[PDB]
Design an enzyme around this catalytic site. Structure first.
Site, short mmCIF file in Angstrom:
data_model
loop_
_atom_site.label_atom_id
_atom_site.label_comp_id
_atom_site.label_asym_id
_atom_site.label_seq_id
_atom_site.Cartn_x
_atom_site.Cartn_y
_atom_site.Cartn_z
N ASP A 115 12.61 0.34 10.08
CA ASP A 115 11.18 0.56 9.70
C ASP A 115 10.37 1.10 10.46
O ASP A 115 10.31 0.76 11.48
CB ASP A 115 10.85 -1.09 9.45
CG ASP A 115 9.43 -1.02 8.30
OD1 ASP A 115 8.66 -0.10 8.29
OD2 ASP A 115 9.37 -1.81 7.56
N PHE A 151 0.80 -1.06 0.09
CA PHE A 151 0.11 0.10 0.04
C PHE A 151 0.88 1.37 -0.08
O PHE A 151 2.10 1.18 0.89
CB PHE A 151 -1.06 -0.09 1.29
CG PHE A 151 -1.86 1.30 1.33
CD1 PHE A 151 -1.15 2.34 2.06
CD2 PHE A 151 -2.91 1.28 1.21
CE1 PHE A 151 -2.00 3.36 2.49
CE2 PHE A 151 -3.81 2.49 1.64
CZ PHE A 151 -3.11 3.64 2.14
N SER A 172 4.75 -6.02 2.40
CA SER A 172 4.07 -5.30 3.35
C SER A 172 2.52 -5.87 3.46
O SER A 172 2.48 -7.10 3.69
CB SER A 172 4.04 -3.63 3.11
OG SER A 172 3.31 -2.82 3.80
N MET A 173 1.65 -4.98 2.97
CA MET A 173 0.41 -5.71 2.68
C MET A 173 0.19 -7.26 1.86
O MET A 173 -0.49 -7.90 2.40
CB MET A 173 -0.58 -4.68 1.85
CG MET A 173 -1.70 -3.95 2.62
SD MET A 173 -2.83 -3.01 1.56
CE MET A 173 -4.31 -4.31 1.80
N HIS A 207 10.97 1.21 5.59
CA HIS A 207 9.84 0.41 4.88
C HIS A 207 9.83 0.06 3.76
O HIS A 207 9.83 -1.06 3.04
CB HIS A 207 8.56 0.87 5.34
CG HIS A 207 7.19 -0.17 5.11
ND1 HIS A 207 7.23 -1.40 5.96
CD2 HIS A 207 5.95 0.01 4.34
CE1 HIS A 207 6.18 -2.05 5.50
NE2 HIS A 207 5.50 -0.93 4.49
#
EC number: 1.11.1.-
Lengths: 441, 441, 441, 441
Positions: free
Chosen positions: A228, A32, A98-99, A257
């Site tokens: 992160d 995202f 991530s997502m 991140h």
């Protein structure tokens, strides 16, 4: 390109996807608020390393449809399922960022690992971001997520700005690791996602993946940036590895991140080594499959033992003087000239070092096919079709619709460099011809 | 092995034949009352010299069927025709001994010389054995032949004995040139022929071949033993050479009728030299035609001079080290890779000895038709047509209806031994390709 | 009769073979320069002793094709393999004489002993005729063999004469052991072999069989004439037995090379005793094989014990009063009528003397296929096929493709003398039926 | 809109294209790293000037697919070919800018100029950018291009910034010729192209177009900015014009590479004038073609001479009093009324000044067709089809499937203003009817 995953009112729901390269399929699942294109630094490396790269845009993002429905990990995992089934992916690697790491866990968990060779988790959500009584290691309270939703609904455009700040650690990395232009591209990508998806996405982030983790069946890689700010390594990757000790585990020192861009190197190197291990295993499996088909043609005995050993050694990368190998084959008693040609063909294809050895007359004579134009005609027709194949199975399947005579002649065409095909397709051809011959005995 | 040539009542008429060696086809046609096996001393030499040897047993003899029909030179020539057509013999040499020389003349005369490169006549019937008013040089009157028929019908077994006496000049040659065992074998062979054929054969001996002789189109050899008691050299070979001055002509000093065994040496040596010379002469002519087409593709300069000289030298039969030739070609600057492939191809085709050299990658890469399946498809179609061609001009003509890309691929197909054509047809193909390429410049 | 073993140019390569008698298959492999017919004295004895006799002519000899290719022991052994596979020979005895002993060793060595019960070596080449540094016991130097080749090429016809002299020790045996007419036949046979094969054969004689010998798996017989001038017993048989101590070993006192004719007696007696042992074992197995199938249908208990004992006693040849046997069977409680019919059938088939007993109603009723015309139709179809079978396994195999109802009816057809088959085929039929019935339980 | 040009793995390769306006087709081929939309200033002018404007996005750019294959001028030219064939473009103008000029040369060279009326080269690559020994005028060494590739791979986003700087001479032109917003749009367009295509494109820039140039068949325009920092006018346009002297040649004083925007005016004005000239040339060609068809109907003689002269004069724009022309025609002896009608029709169509002259009764009577409804029905059907035609050939071709009677009636429909069609289509109709009539004589 699109894959249809469902229907919303009068309109279908289509996922934008891309399909590049040849070899073992690697499926990249973006984060995202970005798209499949965010993997561009990784895709290039994978393409160069010799993998088939599949990317797609999650519903509501990039170039996919923008429904106001299905914003949850079961749907997202079902979406992924449709992609895998649509493309008939076998022996696939699933890589989530991530997502995307939510898809990987939920798919594996619900649908199992039949098509899946290995998994990788980069900047993971896992195991459960929500801070509760029963989840003490949780990264934040519910009120915190409620806040993000409220912020996106207020002005998503402005929101993306502050988000990419912490996403990339721009205070550290701007003008250094990441350019202002690269960041501009990211904002543009995000602004292009659906308004509804933008506000709905953050509600999926505290999905409890704790019961998904024990389901992870196949070799896994966990990779996180220690800097992160978006997903604290301490509430995510570190407690995730406790839950999956077996996972190969890599910390990227001071990586943010958005480590895919800022630390593409460190990222690609870890990924490629892990992938190489998996690829080697896949190659071994293919060799065993190829080896079994090849051996099915040879009469049982001590010679069959020697050949098998030689195959295994060449396949394991150990055997390599092709000239010595070919002479041995040539001088073998009892072996059919045709079987000698097939083995001759296989060895030149698999041996790493062909060196400067001219093609062999004994093989040429064995594969050519007596010079019947009808036979040759069919071999050329098959070759035309094989040229369009990229997989072992697809190749093997179309080959099985041809006679053993046409198949052997086709092998000769390739052997003589009159036509050209990928190694895996060549393997399929060989195996079809072996199957046909063996089946006739 | 058998070839069916017709039908007699409820039974078919089958000819016993053999098919040995590889290279230019040489067809041996035996004499009375023997079989294809009587050529064994000649066959061995031809096999060693590198020819394809075809023998067959005339109807009523050796292992062929024994009908009571078709004992005449038109049928015998039709029988031969069936053999040649059945085997699809191209560029063949026809060698007849005694009776067999009747087949050679009558076939050539009636059916023409399309499949036929050269002819040879050994211990010939020609031109007309019957002594008449209009044929003064005839060897005997009609009453004389009537006599032989009567003698065979009376006791063929006993007859063979006195026949082989004069056939071999046994009073001179027994225990010297011919063994008693060799003679025993001959009698056994004769006794094994059909009773009816034995008595019917001598009626075919005074066939008038006078109108057949002007038809002889191709290079010929006439060979006779001066001690021939069966076919007086003075009524046969000597008047035959007057009728065909052009024929190469060899007298074997004091050789009997059965000179194939007694003088196998003198026989094989003349035969082998003639065999050798014919291919070279025609080969030389073909090389000179080909050279101009080949040179038309090369840019003018000193290199073009070197190449021309090399072509001429290989064409003139200086056996060149192909390996050295090919390396030179490979390392030539300015020469296009395609042009190098064409020359590479030509040199391997024309060079006397390839010496077991593996085919060259540089040529294979040059003549692969770009690996294009459409080119390859057309190349296969052309090949199908070229398989039916026997002449340089016919080959060149059909080749010109194909594109340069398809032509080059076709050349590759042949170079790679995926298909095969005769040298003269291969020449036509290369020349069409050269013409097309040169014409584009 | 012919078996095709390969292709030479436009012609196939066919082996002449014969197939005589019934019982255990014995394959006879002839010597140089003779044919399968040279075994005639041995064949007659084997036929009388109750064996199935298979002979064939090696390529280039007797009535086989005469190629100019494949004159080596791997090809010869491959030729033999084709014969064995073509005829589906099981439990075969391989007997080689002279050259033939090379086939036996090389086949066993390369292809193994799956079809092979025992082997016999008569006037053997083994282990290695070539006299070298590493082979001191060798019979002659290379120059010696080179000599024979040269001699055959010079005049094979004359050559055969001096060869049969030493082959038969004619100076000793002519007019005594061997007639002049018998020798004449041998020369004729040799003169009839191919010219090329004659000269090529002697090059195969110093084949090194030293690594083949340890492969000999099965019981073997070594037999040599002490007066052998062709293969000195001291360089062959005697050093061969050292290499294979396990072999049964027989010296024929003062017997020449051609001991098959001169000492047929001593030859047949040794062969028959060894074979008789093997044959007896085979007979026992057949009875034991039959017995196991037959017993598989009977329920376990004391009755099953009585039946087994009775089977064994009739099988062991105790001539039983069939009338008493059949009444016992008839009156057995618990036994199914069908099972009674099968046993009834088996006993009448195996019992030495039926003593003119009329067929039994209880059996007829049991094996009538329910009087169903469809069953009977299929039974007749099976019978047609069984009429062409000669072996237990072939018979049993085709029978298994039929239903138990059709099988029982077929048995009835034979029992009622409405059709006839050989005992071993009848055994196969009954065993297929038993297998089907037992399998249903 | 998309045109499919090939296949990559599971996905097809589609080119984004647009198709605007009516009239002569003009195909615009964009430069790196932009899309078809970069021609917007030129497209507007062409649309206003009365042309049909076709644009498309090269593979890897704008809205086209982004494969990782086919980045070379043969593929790019093949892509273009597919577009031209897909749309069935006739009499087309090909205009290339920068990279696009490579397509123009390579297509013309390989595929020929059958569909092509004229070509234009703007900010050209030609003839060969690579600086070598044999190419001294080359703009840069190989190492220089290797550098660009490396730069794009490092950060294409940042790269685009410095690229557009020199692309547009922003240090000169920003806030003057080009706005900051216009530049922003360009960067966005580039950032939207495929990552792989971006790095692969610069390798195609030193393609050697030297052998393509002699193939340029049709009228050409060469146009370059003298302030071009991207493609130095001295290594490109100036040496290109030497190679093609015949080309019309325009230097834009101090214009940068991105002259399409900064100097759209000077660009459009040169283009339009050349386009007008090309159109006039096409009209002249059509007039000559039309004239030959028209004359084919007239009987040979002095009248045919007068008519031809009049046609030529009207076609050259010199003759113009239609009323005088029509009266002359009307009063001509010998001329068929039908031929008078056809000429009448042609003159009113071609004459510039029809003025206010009413349509002529003599023509109306000649073309109407006797009033047969079947004939009229077919004329109406043809008219329906002609309404969809835009080319002379397409029009002429469909017309030839109709009878002369239906054709003449169709001409009458148009003449009477009962239906309407473009002049070039009307020409095709006339010529089909002339052909049919002439062919009947």
């Amino acid at each position: 390109p699109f894959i249809t995953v469902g229907q919303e009112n009068s309109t279908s729901i289509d996922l934008y996807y891309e399909d590049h390269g040849t070899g073992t399929p690697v499926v990249l699942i973006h984060g995202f608020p970005l798209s499949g294109h965010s993997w561009e630094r990784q895709s290039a490396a994978l393409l160069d390393a010799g993998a088939r790269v599949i990317t797609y845009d999650r519903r509501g993002f990039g170039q996919s449809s923008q429904p106001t429905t299905g914003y949850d990990y079961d749907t997202f995992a079902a979406d992924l399922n449709t992609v895998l089934e649509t493309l008939d992916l076998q022996d696939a690697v699933l890589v989530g960022f991530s997502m995307g790491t939510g898809e990987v866990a939920r798919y594996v968990s619900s649908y199992g690992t039949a098509r899946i060779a290995a998994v990788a988790f980069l900047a993971s959500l896992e195991p459960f971001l929500l801070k509760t009584d029963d989840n003490p290691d949780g990264a934040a309270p519910q009120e915190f997520f409620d806040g993000i939703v409220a912020a996106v609904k207020a002005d998503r455009y402005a929101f993306y700005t502050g988000f990419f700040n912490d996403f990339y650690n721009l205070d550290e990395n701007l003008g250094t690791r990441i350019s202002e232009e690269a960041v501009r591209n990211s904002w543009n990508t995000a602004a292009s996602g659906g308004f509804f998806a933008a506000a709905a996405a953050p509600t999926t982030w505290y999905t409890d993946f704790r019961a998904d983790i024990p389901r992870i069946d196949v070799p896994a890689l966990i990779l996180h940036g220690t800097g992160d700010r978006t997903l604290p390594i301490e509430n995510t990757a570190r407690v995730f590895h406790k839950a999956l000790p077996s996972a190969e585990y890599v910390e990227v020192e001071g990586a943010p991140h958005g480590l895919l861009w800022t630390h593409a190197e460190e990222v690609n190197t870890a990924l490629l080594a892990f992938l190489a291990k998996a690829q080697e295993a896949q190659k071994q499996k293919l060799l065993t499959e190829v080896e079994t088909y090849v051996l099915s043609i040879i009469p049982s005995g001590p010679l069959k033992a020697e050949i098998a050993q030689r195959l295994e050694d060449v396949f394991a990368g150990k055997n390599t003087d092709l000239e010595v190998l070919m002479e041995w084959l040539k001088t073998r008693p009892i072996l059919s000239p045709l079987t000698k040609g097939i083995l001759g063909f296989v060895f030149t294809l698999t041996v790493p070092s062909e060196r400067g050895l001219q093609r062999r007359r004994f093989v040429q004579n064995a594969l050519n096919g007596n010079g019947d134009p009808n036979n040759m005609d069919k071999a050329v027709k098959l070759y035309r079709k094989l040229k369009r194949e990229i997989t072992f199975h697809g190749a093997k399947e179309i080959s099985l619709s041809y006679s053993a005579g046409a198949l052997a002649s086709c092998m000769g065409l390739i052997y003589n460099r009159m036509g050209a095909v990928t190694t895996e397709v060549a393997f399929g051809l060989v195996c079809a011809t072996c199957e046909q011959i063996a089946d006739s005995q």
